[PDB]
Amino acid sequence: RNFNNLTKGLCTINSWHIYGKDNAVRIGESSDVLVTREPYVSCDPDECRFYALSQGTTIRGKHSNGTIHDRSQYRALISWPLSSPPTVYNSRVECIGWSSTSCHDGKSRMSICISGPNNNASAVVWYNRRPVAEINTWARNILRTQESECVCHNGVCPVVFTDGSATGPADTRIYYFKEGKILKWESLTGTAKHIEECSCYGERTGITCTCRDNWQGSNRPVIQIDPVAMTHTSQYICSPVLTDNPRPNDPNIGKCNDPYPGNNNNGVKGFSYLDGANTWLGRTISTASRSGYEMLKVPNALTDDRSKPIQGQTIVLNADWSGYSGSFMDYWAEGDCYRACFYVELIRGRPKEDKVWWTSNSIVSMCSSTEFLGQWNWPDGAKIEYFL
Amino acid sequence: RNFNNLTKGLCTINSWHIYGKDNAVRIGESSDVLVTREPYVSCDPDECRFYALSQGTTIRGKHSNGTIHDRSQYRALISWPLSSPPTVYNSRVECIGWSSTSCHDGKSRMSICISGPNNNASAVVWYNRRPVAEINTWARNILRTQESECVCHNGVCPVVFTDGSATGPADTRIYYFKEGKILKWESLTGTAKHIEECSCYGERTGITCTCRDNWQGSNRPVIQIDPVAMTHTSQYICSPVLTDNPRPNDPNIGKCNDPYPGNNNNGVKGFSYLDGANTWLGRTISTASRSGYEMLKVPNALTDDRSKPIQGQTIVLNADWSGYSGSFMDYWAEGDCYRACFYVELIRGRPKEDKVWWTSNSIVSMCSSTEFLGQWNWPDGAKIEYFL
Amino acid sequence: RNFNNLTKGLCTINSWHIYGKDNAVRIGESSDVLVTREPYVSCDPDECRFYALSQGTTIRGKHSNGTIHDRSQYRALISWPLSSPPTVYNSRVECIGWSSTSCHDGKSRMSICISGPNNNASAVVWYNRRPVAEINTWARNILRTQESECVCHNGVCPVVFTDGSATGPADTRIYYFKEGKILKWESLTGTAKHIEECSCYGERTGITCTCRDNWQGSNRPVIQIDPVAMTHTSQYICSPVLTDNPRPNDPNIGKCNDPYPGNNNNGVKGFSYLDGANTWLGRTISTASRSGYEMLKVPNALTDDRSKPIQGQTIVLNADWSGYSGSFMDYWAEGDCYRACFYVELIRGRPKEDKVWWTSNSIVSMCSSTEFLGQWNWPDGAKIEYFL
Amino acid sequence: RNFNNLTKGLCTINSWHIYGKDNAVRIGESSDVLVTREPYVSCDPDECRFYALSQGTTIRGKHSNGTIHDRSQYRALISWPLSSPPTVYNSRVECIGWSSTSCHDGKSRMSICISGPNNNASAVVWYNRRPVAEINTWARNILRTQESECVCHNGVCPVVFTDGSATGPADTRIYYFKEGKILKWESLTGTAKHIEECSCYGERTGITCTCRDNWQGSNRPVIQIDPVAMTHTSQYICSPVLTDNPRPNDPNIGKCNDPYPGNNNNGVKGFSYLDGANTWLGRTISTASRSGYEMLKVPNALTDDRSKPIQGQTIVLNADWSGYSGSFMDYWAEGDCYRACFYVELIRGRPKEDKVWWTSNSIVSMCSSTEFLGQWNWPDGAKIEYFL
Numbered sequence A, B, C, D: 001r002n003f004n005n006l007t008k009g010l011c012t013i014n015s016w017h018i019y020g021k022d023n024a025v026r027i028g029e030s031s032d033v034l035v036t037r038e039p040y041v042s043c044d045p046d047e048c049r050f051y052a053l054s055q056g057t058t059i060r061g062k063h064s065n066g067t068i069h070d071r072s073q074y075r076a077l078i079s080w081p082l083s084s085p086p087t088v089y090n091s092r093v094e095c096i097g098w099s100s101t102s103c104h105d106g107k108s109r110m111s112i113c114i115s116g117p118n119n120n121a122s123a124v125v126w127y128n129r130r131p132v133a134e135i136n137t138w139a140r141n142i143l144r145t146q147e148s149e150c151v152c153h154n155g156v157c158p159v160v161f162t163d164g165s166a167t168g169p170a171d172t173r174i175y176y177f178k179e180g181k182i183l184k185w186e187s188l189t190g191t192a193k194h195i196e197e198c199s200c201y202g203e204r205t206g207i208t209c210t211c212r213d214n215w216q217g218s219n220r221p222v223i224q225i226d227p228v229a230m231t232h233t234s235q236y237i238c239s240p241v242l243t244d245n246p247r248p249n250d251p252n253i254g255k256c257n258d259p260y261p262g263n264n265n266n267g268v269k270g271f272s273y274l275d276g277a278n279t280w281l282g283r284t285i286s287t288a289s290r291s292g293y294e295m296l297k298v299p300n301a302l303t304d305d306r307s308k309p310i311q312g313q314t315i316v317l318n319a320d321w322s323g324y325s326g327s328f329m330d331y332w333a334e335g336d337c338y339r340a341c342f343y344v345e346l347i348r349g350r351p352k353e354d355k356v357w358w359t360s361n362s363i364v365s366m367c368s369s370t371e372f373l374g375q376w377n378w379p380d381g382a383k384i385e386y387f388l
């Protein structure tokens, strides 16, 4: 077939509709559901699937004890059918490791998994389900990547990596792959001061990634990538509507070219859609912890350091646990525009619910509507007491 | 490929033969079978499948407690292979929500799921497994739809929706979709006074839907749709053979243009095949509760307010629990006529069997024969005591 | 594609090699394996599969209690991948009922399932996974069929049915189907006096079925069918090597045209390959019960009432339980001849092992070799005590 | 399609990257995972899969008791998706038996399974999922084969078999198959004195097999096969870096044409890649038992009796249990060279961990990189105490 080209703009976002939900923890109470975390969603030209890092055990399995741990030899990127839960019997292993990204270029899928000890990790780049290229750690401190889908244009698929400290300056690189081969890489440039866990989407203007500053900032850094020239810039979302977690309260002036201060050495993966007057930002409702989730329409959030919300939608009540969130779109859908989508990881278990000894999650996902739809809220839905 | 056209009449119905049965509750006693309700059956050009609303838990799972509840964030329309049970590992999620319909147009399948709180629900229309259009509540009172398959002609697939009171006048609309797009909608016209849970089938004359009057009537309202002109009429089945549940005893004069009185604010989804002398009506055997099921040959039931049965077939004994029933046909079968089919939902658990804390069902399904076949009866088959 | 034609002779049978074995009862001790009985094997042009009548419950499920019972509304013909066990999650339902046959004609598969009460049973004939024709009971006494595969030539697939007494004269019919349609049926002719559970195979000479005389005979009746003329003859295997069970000891003169006496009102489904000097007969080792299984090379067994064995092979030791056995071949294999195959049902549980309350089986299957291969024996392999 | 030809050399091996890992024992603690042993990996042109000999029971099943036993009627060669575990519901049976090999020739797959008692075993050769040829025992003492993949060139697939004593001279044969048919076989020639469990790979020079001398040698015998002429030679790896287990300590002079002495009547399946300066050898870290695993770069190991390591990589720590290891490659990958791969069987349970009554394994697999990648170690990961 042919490589996909980013030839459309975003659809107008007037509200968000339910797209997928797997109820994995509810079902896993009484089924062979794998413990996971760091989920995402990614489409092929003929199917969309859920993705996540398995922990190599089921929830009811005794090996679920200790799964708060992020990195082990028992983790792997798995995918499974949209809105099904990740079961032992329906999950397809994409590659082995504890940090990942994946995207389809229109012809085949590229998946990248990083594994190894903290001081000697390596990425293996798979294309069309075969290993093609490998990248060794350059800073010997937890080589790591997006934890959500990458995006491709005319065969070129950029991916953001970081290696180095999580609590100070680190070495971030943007890699440009084609058919799994390394075309080029560049060191991070621009005014973003620290980069983790980029959430990306593409449209005719280029590729936009909204990341996590784990060091000093509670505004989110943004990397904008031209996949044709294979170049990028970076800054922060200018808006005073702050979207990392934990975070300070919203001021009236944001920061475009430096971290907004108040919270250090922590954060959460998140996302945004930055599209002028059609801009929407995602964030946890709580400023203290990974609870709740909302979308806020914030015109020109990227560039306007005074911008505030003019519309919103609650996705998960503050009373309910959330977690990581990221962007994806069905680039192969019919129509004249790309419909913005996102997922929210709904983390259950440790550290917040420590009566159980495991940590897992379920997934909820939404896409945009041009209608102004009524809102519901979407909890994980499992009762912790049932697992005791 | 090509859109299916309704170019045939119904086959002559001389009896009913077994088509499918999943024994879901029997199997779910000792397997990872999802709790469901509101099942149906629908064919693609190359396969026929069972459908239902999952409750996002298995039967033996602790989350099965409380599944008498109709609407939650944990429900989804699932489909699975004909006569298999709906398991965690074989069920395909079509969309997320607590009211649904689905149909194949010959090229691709349209599925519609409604979700949300009672005062802010919305329908998402999926086509070829992608979300295409969305419809917001118009009466802010449980936007809801068929709970069985829709039917298509030359790409046009009509669907009946209701929004508003379940116990008085409500706002019913007929929507006409093509490739998931809204071509047109109309407010209900005709003499049907209240519409719920329409069961539809198509043939050369047009599309016929037999619905549930939940307000005052125990005769069933009928909507007849011309999918070419995109217009409809409505009335009730004229026959004094009453087919809702609960219901009064059969009189000798029915009602064509108004509810037959005696039972208010309740009902059950049901169906009929209205075809002159080849007319057959389905109903529960009991007039009081959802138990038993029978088919009755009632010539000209639609138009003759004196019509009585001249032949029948017991499907489920009165001693056994039934539930919802609806119509479907294999529009892609060989031959010169469409073979009428139906399913019966066999509800187990609450409220009728309250020693368990769950509510689920299994499915039995029949299609017509031109032979005069011997009859059996088809119970769910599970022993409640085994679940205690 | 094209209808298969029977254009080859049987390969020379010099021994038997292992073909498939599912170990279903061993695995079902700790997995969701369906209770079955009456298994067989049948090939499509691109795959061979195991078949059986499910009981609509797993072995460890509480509903396994009482599965010695032959006929219920919870039974169905299922198929599953060769040598896998019949699980809830991998079994495909072919049709609903408690007596079956199935065969591929080269283009599509025909499957036939009979259901109903003893006095009102009916067959539904499925073709290309759709119901096509139905046949009502003609003797009102357990309409029943082969319990192993049928065979097709140029689209014509003959099937043997019986309706009536199991312990006296009954009404046997041979039906000729094409694309599921009834071309013709004939009443049984010839010297076979009672017919049950025919096991059939085809080759250039025509179709040969070896059946069970449940009335007075312990030699097996044979029906020979010409699928072109759509005619048949019948007699018994002439050989004094008797192959029904239970049965008298082997005499030195068999019976060609009447039952060999000594055992009444019982029997077991079995098979043979009748091919002049290349003739092999299957039988239980025990004359008293369904235990053991052996193949015996008995030249001209069909026609020679003095014929004895000149070679043999033990398949299952007398110490181990067997059961039904039947013939099938891969008509789509490469080469100049059809390789004879068979399966043996290995029954576990009731009535012979009554410490458990269920009855199920596993499958072992062999095909012929032109080599003279060493023999092993093939027990079910499960330990009953594990189920207590 | 077309038969694959071996037209490329090996890629330069500068380190090894993670390829696959199934975590089968961890997952099997709480899922329906089959007990296995003797695993391997093999690619089709469109997919790579894990293979192993099932024991016909799950790990948690009561029939897992006694699975240290190598040969029973309940074993079968199964395959399943790369990095998934071998479950009851996802495992495909290739053939029945207790010793196997399998390989794809570019058009279809050949699989070979041996079954029978020790004195009467036989191989059945399957091609395109059908039995094609059979081979009877020639020495009446456990006919046996590779336990990892074979390799094909222009349709010709050589396979190494042994029949006879495991502790003295035996009868080894090299068979040459095409489309499952026997083209030719030869008795072993050359200086290898005993052959077991050959691990093979192919490249433009021909096919290279590294085997196990179970009799007197702790260096590994090598068979080099020309699949065009259908001839072979044999010797031992000349290097003093000894790679069998158990084994003596490494001397400074190896043995090219005779066993290196010190350990008798034992061994382990292993492998090597013999490619001049690009030579890498696999071995257990322990000289005493099947624990640990490492790769060592040993230039000209095949031919240089003084050769030592110049680079290495730990795969499994000595503290962790290993087991069998073997070679495979994706012959259908893109690029100008074949990327060397291997698997290591990670044995859990008996005899080394006798608090449980079963023996099973999981799989880890690596392929070569032209980068110099950081190393991790890859334990099975299950906690035995959880199974008590």
Ligand SMILES: *[C@@H]1O[C@H](CO)[C@@H](O[C@@H]2O[C@H](CO)[C@@H](O[C@@H]3O[C@H](CO[C@H]4O[C@H](CO[C@H]5O[C@H](CO)[C@@H](O)[C@H](O)[C@@H]5O)[C@@H](O)[C@H](O[C@H]5O[C@H](CO)[C@@H](O)[C@H](O)[C@@H]5O)[C@@H]4O)[C@@H](O)[C@H](O[C@H]4O[C@H](CO)[C@@H](O)[C@H](O)[C@@H]4O[C@H]4O[C@H](CO)[C@@H](O)[C@H](O)[C@@H]4O[C@H]4O[C@H](CO)[C@@H](O)[C@H](O)[C@@H]4O)[C@@H]3O)[C@H](O)[C@H]2NC(C)=O)[C@H](O)[C@H]1NC(C)=O
Residues within 6 Å of the ligand: A240, A241, A248, A249, A250, A285, A286, A287, A294, A295, A296, A308, A309, A310, A311, A312, A313, A372, A373, A374, A375, B119, B120
């Ligand atoms: C059925 O479903 C529908 C569809 O979902 C439901 O309708 C939805 O209802 C929700 C809830 O109300 C709405 O979400 C909120 O939207 C507002 C924004 O809209 C308001 O403000 C707009 C801007 O006004 C400004 O400019 C205009 C320009 O003309 C000017 O006129 C005005 O004076 C002002 O200067 C208005 O344009 C807008 O009016 C329009 O819409 C109205 C309906 O909403 C309609 O009535 C009007 O006629 C008109 O058409 C409207 O007034 C968001 O501000 C709000 O988000 C804030 O509040 C929530 C809590 O509710 C909070 O979680 C958010 O984070 C946010 O507040 C935080 O951040 C702010 C920014 O920094 C900060 O200022 C706040 O103090 C607060 O900060 C604190 O909390 C955060 C988070 O914990 C923390 O980080 C901080 O540090 C700090 O602690 C909501 O998103 C939907 O827009 C609305 N949708 C639609 C289509 O109507 C309907 O209710 C359902 N029906 C039923 C019966 O249930």
Ligand SMILES: *[C@@H]1O[C@H](CO)[C@@H](O[C@@H]2O[C@H](CO)[C@@H](O[C@@H]3O[C@H](CO[C@H]4O[C@H](CO[C@H]5O[C@H](CO)[C@@H](O)[C@H](O)[C@@H]5O)[C@@H](O)[C@H](O[C@H]5O[C@H](CO)[C@@H](O)[C@H](O)[C@@H]5O)[C@@H]4O)[C@@H](O)[C@H](O[C@H]4O[C@H](CO)[C@@H](O)[C@H](O)[C@@H]4O[C@H]4O[C@H](CO)[C@@H](O)[C@H](O)[C@@H]4O[C@H]4O[C@H](CO)[C@@H](O)[C@H](O)[C@@H]4O)[C@@H]3O)[C@H](O)[C@H]2NC(C)=O)[C@H](O)[C@H]1NC(C)=O
Residues within 6 Å of the ligand: B240, B241, B248, B249, B250, B285, B286, B287, B294, B295, B296, B308, B309, B310, B311, B312, B313, B372, B373, B374, B375, C119, C120
């Ligand atoms: C093997 O299998 C076969 C195939 O399945 C079995 O054969 C089947 O047997 C069943 C059971 O008998 C039949 O179902 C019933 O059919 C009758 C209708 O047929 C009868 O009436 C016909 C009409 O007669 C009228 O017009 C003719 C015109 O000539 C006139 O001559 C006559 O006098 C009268 O005016 C007759 O034509 C028909 O005769 C034909 O068929 C006969 C065989 O059936 C044959 O012998 C004849 O020679 C001739 O060929 C026959 O007499 C249905 O009426 C009946 O349904 C009613 O009864 C059941 C209970 O059994 C009930 O559940 C139904 O709901 C219904 O009765 C309720 O509704 C009525 C309508 O309002 C009402 O009047 C009743 O009082 C009753 O209402 C009460 O209960 C309901 C429900 O709870 C409640 O809602 C009300 O409020 C109230 O409380 C059956 O459907 C099959 O048709 C028949 N099939 C065939 C092909 O033969 C066979 O038995 C099996 N064999 C064995 C050994 O088991």
Ligand SMILES: *[C@@H]1O[C@H](CO)[C@@H](O[C@@H]2O[C@H](CO)[C@@H](O[C@@H]3O[C@H](CO[C@H]4O[C@H](CO[C@H]5O[C@H](CO)[C@@H](O)[C@H](O)[C@@H]5O)[C@@H](O)[C@H](O[C@H]5O[C@H](CO)[C@@H](O)[C@H](O)[C@@H]5O)[C@@H]4O)[C@@H](O)[C@H](O[C@H]4O[C@H](CO)[C@@H](O)[C@H](O)[C@@H]4O[C@H]4O[C@H](CO)[C@@H](O)[C@H](O)[C@@H]4O[C@H]4O[C@H](CO)[C@@H](O)[C@H](O)[C@@H]4O)[C@@H]3O)[C@H](O)[C@H]2NC(C)=O)[C@H](O)[C@H]1NC(C)=O
Residues within 6 Å of the ligand: C240, C241, C248, C249, C250, C285, C286, C287, C294, C295, C296, C308, C309, C310, C311, C312, C313, C372, C373, C374, C375, D119, D120
């Ligand atoms: C490795 O594997 C290989 C391959 O599997 C093993 O080799 C196999 O070994 C088995 C077991 O021995 C053989 O099966 C038996 O075959 C014999 C038939 O072959 C014998 O008889 C032939 C016919 O002889 C007659 O005609 C010839 C014409 O020349 C004449 O010369 C002769 O005198 C006589 O008149 C001989 O041709 C044949 O010799 C050939 O083969 C020999 C090797 O087998 C070889 O040594 C010779 O050189 C020559 O090449 C040979 O002598 C079957 O008769 C036998 O089946 C009977 O016995 C078993 C019990 O073992 C029983 O279960 C059967 O049902 C049957 O006996 C019952 O039925 C009879 C018929 O009515 C009846 O007469 C019996 O009394 C008995 O009836 C009783 O029991 C039944 C059942 O419960 C009951 O219903 C009755 O009422 C009654 O109670 C076996 O099938 C294989 O053929 C053989 N295969 C090969 C290729 O060699 C090898 O052993 C393995 N190696 C190791 C180390 O384990």
Ligand SMILES: *[C@@H]1O[C@H](CO)[C@@H](O[C@@H]2O[C@H](CO)[C@@H](O[C@@H]3O[C@H](CO[C@H]4O[C@H](CO[C@H]5O[C@H](CO)[C@@H](O)[C@H](O)[C@@H]5O)[C@@H](O)[C@H](O[C@H]5O[C@H](CO)[C@@H](O)[C@H](O)[C@@H]5O)[C@@H]4O)[C@@H](O)[C@H](O[C@H]4O[C@H](CO)[C@@H](O)[C@H](O)[C@@H]4O[C@H]4O[C@H](CO)[C@@H](O)[C@H](O)[C@@H]4O[C@H]4O[C@H](CO)[C@@H](O)[C@H](O)[C@@H]4O)[C@@H]3O)[C@H](O)[C@H]2NC(C)=O)[C@H](O)[C@H]1NC(C)=O
Residues within 6 Å of the ligand: A119, A120, D240, D241, D248, D249, D250, D285, D286, D287, D294, D295, D296, D308, D309, D310, D311, D312, D313, D372, D373, D374, D375
């Ligand atoms: C991040 O990851 C990276 C990548 O994985 C890590 O880097 C890797 O580190 C490992 C561990 O050190 C290395 O593996 C070892 O490799 C050595 C071989 O390389 C050494 O020797 C080479 C040859 O030297 C000879 O020739 C040269 C020619 O010039 C001559 O100069 C020299 O004097 C000598 O004559 C050197 O070329 C090489 O130097 C190069 O590489 C260095 C880095 O490694 C670098 O610093 C240099 O500048 C230069 O570039 C280097 O010195 C293997 O020998 C070794 O394997 C032995 O030891 C292990 C235990 O560690 C043992 O398990 C092995 O079996 C083996 O030792 C046994 O067998 C021997 C052979 O018979 C025997 O002699 C031993 O006594 C021993 O035998 C005993 O045990 C066995 C097993 O139980 C038993 O059977 C026997 O009977 C007996 O009981 C390792 O494989 C990697 O190569 C290296 N990779 C790279 C790319 O650098 C890095 O460490 C990680 N970072 C962090 C922070 O963790």
Ligand SMILES: *[C@@H]1O[C@H](CO)[C@@H](O)[C@H](O)[C@H]1NC(C)=O
Residues within 6 Å of the ligand: A002, A003, A004, A005, A106, A154
């Ligand atoms: C994307 O653009 C490239 C470069 O012009 C073109 O070759 C390719 O066909 C395009 N892809 C599609 C889907 O048309």
Ligand SMILES: *[C@@H]1O[C@H](CO)[C@@H](O)[C@H](O)[C@H]1NC(C)=O
Residues within 6 Å of the ligand: B002, B003, B004, B005, B106, B154
């Ligand atoms: C249905 O009718 C339309 C309109 O004439 C036609 O284009 C289409 O091909 C028909 N569908 C089939 C299956 O022939």
Ligand SMILES: *[C@@H]1O[C@H](CO)[C@@H](O)[C@H](O)[C@H]1NC(C)=O
Residues within 6 Å of the ligand: C002, C003, C004, C005, C106, C154
């Ligand atoms: C079988 O014979 C018929 C009748 O001549 C022929 O039409 C058909 O093609 C044949 N089938 C095959 C597989 O050739």
Ligand SMILES: *[C@@H]1O[C@H](CO)[C@@H](O)[C@H](O)[C@H]1NC(C)=O
Residues within 6 Å of the ligand: D002, D003, D004, D005, D106, D154
């Ligand atoms: C391998 O070589 C043979 C013999 O020349 C040739 O016919 C075949 O096409 C080749 N295979 C491929 C994949 O080209």
Ligand SMILES: *[C@@H]1O[C@H](CO)[C@@H](O)[C@H](O)[C@H]1NC(C)=O
Residues within 6 Å of the ligand: D065, D066, D357
């Ligand atoms: C395993 O089998 C042996 C009999 O050989 C028995 O001694 C032992 O107790 C068994 N283990 C379990 C867990 O039943």
Ligand SMILES: [Ca+2]
Residues within 6 Å of the ligand: A212, A213, A214, A215, A216, A217, A218, A244, A245, A263, A265, A266, A267, A268
């Ligand atoms: Ca931060």
Ligand SMILES: [Ca+2]
Residues within 6 Å of the ligand: B212, B213, B214, B215, B216, B217, B218, B244, B245, B263, B265, B266, B267, B268
């Ligand atoms: Ca009503």
Ligand SMILES: [Ca+2]
Residues within 6 Å of the ligand: C212, C213, C214, C215, C216, C217, C218, C244, C245, C263, C265, C266, C267, C268
């Ligand atoms: Ca008999």
Ligand SMILES: [Ca+2]
Residues within 6 Å of the ligand: D212, D213, D214, D215, D216, D217, D218, D244, D245, D263, D265, D266, D267, D268
């Ligand atoms: Ca050795």
